[PDB]
């Protein structure tokens, strides 16, 4: 229901689905630049990543993996 | 007991001969009650109560004092709720009122035609609420709706302003049907649930494990109850001597496991012997954005009932054997996007080119490869969607009359006027084809069809076959021909008394045939009276 | 392929005949076209004409689908903006070259239009040169379907799903309304692939979950079930032993092993029992080389709908070699099982008992179907009567039972 | 009314005067003649049993029913038909034997059923009883 | 069982009221109908016993 580029707020919806025969409120956690990724239509299961985002509120470090056997 | 069982087979007659009508007012006990459905349009008054055996012996029998009321096992919140009454009211009066309501639309007899009204709403307006693809509640379609800004003024629907008179509302709300007035015209209806409906089921008291489930049932398909309220109706319907109006828009039967389970099936086959037997016309329309598919096209084609049947489309309405998915799933698969691709797609195209080109570097090789592939899959969703509107090119109108399965694409704006005399026309013609079908009921629906259109030809000329295209100059035409009695307008008439003469012809020379033993003393009779004249002339020819 | 078909039997000497029509799969995987449906319309025409039962074997994938080859391969499109396609596009169309060929064909409608400087020609109609994969095979079905249901009023249809029926051809087997199901088949409109798909995950795996057997024998879709064709066809012969040759025809008459002026050995009682043992008889409970003799003709008795709405038992006999129908009442409580709907994860399987001596919804309307049909073959009727009340509870209410019973009073 | 439930003989009336209120609802739909004066609206007349179970028509006061159930033919100009229209109105009295079923209703229902079917106009029912009439030798 | 024999006489005495409803149904056809039946006559009379022909011209 937006368009890429575009700023977006906490708790705000963004998208909206049908699911079971049913609607769901796709609502947004958090604010910043969106940049949409999956495009529509296509069947997704749990744990799928369907946008990234460019928050105004950058944060700590993030992961390093090193270990092999 | 004797007397009973007696009227009951009657009363099944009656209800195949007549309308019957029941009004619970009290209570219906027992063989009242039976008699009740066998009259089967039933309106109900508030607090009665609709039982076969008490409270008071079934909680004996039971054990414990399980019921408290018998308005807990037949209320109107039972009969209501499931079809068995056609309407409540709050007392008597009220019931005596819907009574008359609904027969202002009913013949007075079987021998009679419907009456006809001269309506206060014109029959060439338009309809100023506009079917949209998003759902929407189609009382607004029907019946219109307030305009949201003036508040004062009223966004009419299809139908005549008050004139719609609801049945069955709270009982399988994924459908809706009824009976209405179009000019004063009475017909019966069909119309399509769109949103999703909430079920209530209620809880089975004698039973500690039964609850109260809560049922999403999908709009755009028919159920059993669906189909047994359908079947019902339009028998109803059928018996009263209505044509109909179907606003259809049909995605297909549910095919879940509850609903294979309950028999949806046998339901459908029932709805397809009561058509069979159906005697008048009906009109199915499929509206702007609707789609109807498969079975639903299969089970309603105008070939079951072709005498009587008839089909029109919008442009925005679609229909087919199959939804695009499935035929995309079965009959555009990778093979087939990739194929796209090299026919069309710039990129594609020329990276094969390059692929297409001698003595590269296997390293070359694979990183150009890959690069395709990535292209490409970050390509194959929308290539998809092309394809699934490619398919939904093949299912339009244009075809659909080229090959004679349709009889006309419509336009929504405007297709009110033509369904109106239209339908008058069509109707009165059938009429016709039944005072014929009475002057000799061994000619088959092609001859009968036959013969008066060529009769029209004979007197009005050749030049002026394209008038009978017009539905306004024949109805009126047809008027003069069927009003004056005793004039130069029974033409028709004396041409039937003709044909009659000779069917009648046919039976006695047959019926010699068979027994010529008969002859004389026929003659004797026959004999019996005649002219002086036509004796000597016997005697001439002997 | 169709056949009609005359053969003596013990019952009809002199001999009888049948019309028989079965679809090929592998000929264009059983798909149906116009000359498929004439010829399944004239076989049934002619039936209609002499009276003579009509059996259909189904094994097939429904209407024929397709799309152009010719034109898949040779279309464009009109992108809104090449250097990127996902803004969407308008239209599909073909270059002069392409258009001047299939334009006089009736295969097309397209319009010239003058675009970005080039001459296109939008695609607004797709006719589809290609005769038998159009809704002429919707015409022909709802043909058959109004002349089916007339069949079935003037004559016995039988269907057998060997293999697959698929919708339109499970529609004809219920008209047929008299149906054998092969075990291991199964019957469908829409597949459990586009089913999974519109509900966004694999929740049925098999159309035998939906179509064996144990759905349409335990709820009165299928009459009866055989391990494999030959044993269909052996109960199909068995079940025609009682059948007239015509409506214009007397029963067959039997010289019957089985002597008429013989006693009853079984005495009914208070106590609850099979009404097997009663018509049927039963092993001696001493001698057990003997036989409790029962009301009709040792070995005579062919049961139907025997797992579905167990409170009734009905059924087809022989008394003295002349066959009638049969009607008797299940006297001890019936344990009924409620399968659990796996799409919706709160529905569970309810397990009901179900007392004996009473009529429920299934049993009028089990016995509404057995009625009329033996009654528009022109058959003799024995009941059993035994009944003490309708079932008048919260669900069967709900259920309409009322409704049914006023269809049995229209029947008879 | 103490029982919750309509006097079998005021439905006449009731009727009459609801038909007033239609004639004046359904002008606003079409364009309709004058109603014509409720004294001429309706004409009915009562059905009764001879003693051959036979069909007699009889103009008496009311409250002279000898059986649980009452019946009526019944003739009325309306704004679909000016020039009248016939129906057959049958109805339960509750007072006779609490409104139980016997012979002489069953054969009241059967012979003005058989009326009914004779000229094919609708049969109303107005349903409101305890069944068949049972009894013991006292 | 015993076809043209002295056994169908029942059968015999059917076909008489056969012949009698028949008779009824064509002169009821004519009571309605009577401007048909001269015509009807010639069709009728194309076949009958001479002596039946002359007789019906002594009793005209």
């Not at chain 4, 009915?44 to 103009?59: A, C, P, S």
Request: glycine share 8%; net charge negative; with cysteine.
């Amino acid at each position: 229901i937006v368009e890429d580029g575009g700023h977006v707020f906490a708790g705000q919806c963004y998208a909206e689905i049908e699911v079971m025969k049913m609607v769901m409120t796709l609502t947004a956690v958090e604010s910043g630049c969106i940049h949409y990724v999956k495009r529509p239509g296509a069947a997704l299961d749990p744990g799928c990543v369907l946008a990234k985002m460019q928050l105004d509120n950058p944060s700590k470090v993030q992961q390093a993996e090193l270990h092999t056997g | 007991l004797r007397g009973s069982g007696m009227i009951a087979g009657e009363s099944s007659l009656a209800y195949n001969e007549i309308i019957t009508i029941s009004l619970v007012t009290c209570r219906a006990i027992g063989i009242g009650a039976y008699l009740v459905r066998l009259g089967q349009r039933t309106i109900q008054v508030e607090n009665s109560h609709l039982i076969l055996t008490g409270a008071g012996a079934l909680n004996k029998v039971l054990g414990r004092e399980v019921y408290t009321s018998n308005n807990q096992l037949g209320g109107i919140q039972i009969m209501h709720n499931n079809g068995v009454t056609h309407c409540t009211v709050c007392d008597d009066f009220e019931g005596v009122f819907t009574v008359l309501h609904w027969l202002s639309y009913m013949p007075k007899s079987v021998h009679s035609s419907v009456p006809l009204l001269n309506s206060k709403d014109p029959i060439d307006r338009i309809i100023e609420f506009v079917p949209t693809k998003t759902p929407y509640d189609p009382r607004w379609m029907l019946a219109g709706r307030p305009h949201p800004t003036q508040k004062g003024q009223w966004l009419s629907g299809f139908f005549d302003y008050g004139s719609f008179s609801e049945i069955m509302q709270p009982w399988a709300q994924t459908v809706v049907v009824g009976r209405a007035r179009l000019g004063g015209i009475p017909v019966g209806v069909v119309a399509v649930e769109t949103r999703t409906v909430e079920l209530s089921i209620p809880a089975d008291p004698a039973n500690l494990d039964s609850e109260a489930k809560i049922i999403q049932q999908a709009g755009q398909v028919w159920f059993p109850d669906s189909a047994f309220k359908t079947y019902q109706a339009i028998k109803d319907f059928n018996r009263e001597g209505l044509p109909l109006m179907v606003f259809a828009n049909w995605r297909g039967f549910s095919g879940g496991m509850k609903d294979m389970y309950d028999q949806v099936l046998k339901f459908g086959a029932y709805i397809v012997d009561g058509l069979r037997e159906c005697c008048q016309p009906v009109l199915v329309y499929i509206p702007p954005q609707a789609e109807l598919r498969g079975g639903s096209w299969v089970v309603i084609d105008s070939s079951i009932n072709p005498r009587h049947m008839e089909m029109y489309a919008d442009r925005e309405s679609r229909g087919s054997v199959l939804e695009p998915e499935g035929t995309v799933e079965i009959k555009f698969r990778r093979k087939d996007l990739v194929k796209t691709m090299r026919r069309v797609d710039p990129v594609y195209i020329h990276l094969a080119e390059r692929l297409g080109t001698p003595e590269l570097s296997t390293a070359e090789r694979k990183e150009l490869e890959n690069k395709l592939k990535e292209r490409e899959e970050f390509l194959i969703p929308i290539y998809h969607q092309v394809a699934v509107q490619f398919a939904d090119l093949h299912d339009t109108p244009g075809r659909m009359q080229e090959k004679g399965v349709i009889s006309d694409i419509l336009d929504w704006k405007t297709s009110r006027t033509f369904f109106y005399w239209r339908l008058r026309r069509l109707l009165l013609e059938d009429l016709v084809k039944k005072k014929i079908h009475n002057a000799n009921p061994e000619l088959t629906d092609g001859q009968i069809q036959a013969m008066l259109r060529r009769w029209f030809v004979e007197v009005e000329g050749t030049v002026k076959a394209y008038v009978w295209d017009n539905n306004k100059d024949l109805a009126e035409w047809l008027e003069k021909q069927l009003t004056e009695e005793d004039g130069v307008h029974s033409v028709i008439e004396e041409n039937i008394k003709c044909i009659s003469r000779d069917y009648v012809l046919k039976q006695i020379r047959s019926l010699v045939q068979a027994n010529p033993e008969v002859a004389m003393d026929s003659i004797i009779h026959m004999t019996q009276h005649i002219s002086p004249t036509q004796r000597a002339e016997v005697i001439r020819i002997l | 392929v169709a056949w009609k078909m005359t053969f003596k039997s013990p019952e009809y000497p002199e001999g009888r005949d049948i019309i028989v029509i079965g679809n090929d799969i592998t000929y264009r995987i059983g798909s149906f076209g116009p000359q498929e449906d004439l010829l399944f319309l004239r076989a049934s025409e002619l039936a209609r004409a002499e009276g003579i039962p009509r059996i259909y074997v189904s094994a097939n994938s429904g209407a024929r689908i397709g799309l152009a080859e010719e034109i898949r391969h040779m279309f464009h499109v009109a992108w809104v903006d090449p250097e990127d396609p996902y803004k969407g596009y308008r239209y599909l169309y073909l270059t002069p070259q392409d258009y001047k060929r299939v334009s006089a064909l009736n295969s097309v409608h397209c319009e010239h239009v003058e675009d970005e400087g080039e001459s296109r020609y939008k695609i607004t109609d797709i006719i589809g040169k290609e005769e038998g994969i159009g809704p002429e095979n919707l015409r022909g079905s709802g043909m058959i379907a109004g002349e089916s249901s007339l069949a079935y009023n003037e004559i016995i249809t039988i269907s057998l799903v060997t293999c697959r029926a698929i919708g339109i051809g499970a529609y004809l087997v219920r008209l047929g309304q008299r149906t054998i199901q092969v075990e291991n088949s199964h019957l469908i409109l829409t597949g459990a692939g586009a089913l999974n798909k519109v509900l966004g995950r694999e929740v049925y795996t098999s159309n035998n979950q939906l179509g064996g057997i144990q759905i349409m024998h335990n709820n009165g879709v299928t009459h009866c079930t055989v391990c494999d064709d030959f044993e269909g066809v052996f109960t199909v012969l068995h079940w025609l032993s009682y059948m007239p040759k015509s409506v214009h025809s007397s029963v067959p008459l039997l010289n019957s092993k089985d002597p008429i002026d013989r006693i009853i050995e079984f005495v009914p009682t208070k106590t609850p029992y099979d009404p097997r043992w009663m018509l049927a008889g039963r092993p001696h409970p001493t001698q057990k080389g003997q036989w409790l003799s029962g009301f009709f003709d040792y070995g005579s008795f062919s049961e139907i709908m025997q797992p579905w709405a167990q409170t009734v038992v009905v059924g087809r006999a022989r008394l003295g070699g002349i066959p009638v129908g049969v009607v008797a009442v299940e006297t001890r409580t019936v344990e009924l099982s409620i399968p659990a709907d796996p799409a919706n994860l709160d529905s569970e399987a309810k397990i009901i008992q179900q007392a004996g001596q009473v009529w429920f919804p299934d049993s009028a309307f089990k016995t509404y179907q057995a009625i009329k049909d033996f009654n528009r073959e022109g058959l003799p009727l024995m009941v059993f009567a035994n009944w003490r009340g309708f079932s008048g509870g919260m669900k069967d209410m709900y259920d309409q039972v009322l409704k049914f019973g006023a269809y049995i009073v229209d029947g008879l | 009314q103490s029982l919750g439930t309509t006097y079998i003989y005021d439905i006449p009336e009731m009727f009459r005067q609801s038909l007033i209120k239609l004639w004046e609802s359904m002008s606003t739909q079409a364009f309709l003649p004058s109603p014509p004066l409720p004294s001429d609206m309706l004409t009915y007349t009562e059905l009764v049993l001879d003693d051959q179970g036979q069909l007699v028509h009889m103009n008496r006061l009311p409250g002279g029913n000898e059986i649980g159930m009452v019946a009526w033919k019944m003739t009325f100009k309306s704004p679909e038909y000016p020039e009248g229209r016939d129906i057959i109105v049958i109805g339960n009295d509750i007072t006779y034997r609490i409104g139980s079923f016997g012979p002489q209703e069953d054969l009241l229902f059967l012979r003005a059923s058989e009326l009914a079917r004779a000229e094919g106009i609708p049969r109303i029912y107005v349903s409101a009883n305890s069944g068949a009439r049972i009894g013991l030798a006292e």
